[PDB]
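Still learning. Show one?

>
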Amino acid sequence: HMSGPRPVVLSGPSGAGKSTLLKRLLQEHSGIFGFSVSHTTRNPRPGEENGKDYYFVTREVMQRDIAAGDFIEHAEFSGNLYGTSKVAVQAVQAMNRICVLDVDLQGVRNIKATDLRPIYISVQPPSLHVLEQRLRQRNTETEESLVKRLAAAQADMESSKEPGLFDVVIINDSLDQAYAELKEALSEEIKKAQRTGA
């Protein structure tokens, strides 16, 4: 269908190949997909710039943006405030790109509760035990964190079955098979972003 491309939401259980599908997607479709720039009260670090990495605003301007519409995704940690203003999604669309978000299951429930309507994509591990095997095969994990991470993945696997949560429900049966289902699921929005086909 020939029209302007809509934004996209990625979700599902922890890991599940999502980050590697996303890195393949943005490298193949070079600069056609782009991320929503989060608003923040922080000062920039060396090599950061406003509108490149983060939208750097004052604590007064950040709360003024919460009062405008940022509150859907606002967060506070260690005395700094963060969020997704609707300006940040529209910024990527104004460069004529696909705007990308990637969020937890509660993040998906937040987006559909406001006047936003992106395409909703979830990716899941092939079985909950395979996610356990993949985590135990790395040195970064420990048994206390594994229990919390598997208990989170259990609830995320159940929310990923709900018909109101997602338009698209992919399995990581293979990285190549999941990438093919992802690229086919996005094929209409890619055709629209390349401005080609029916």
About this structure: The chain has one domain: 8-194. Residues 8-194 form a domain with the Rossmann fold fold (CATH 3.40.50.300). The two ends are 5 Å apart (CA to CA).
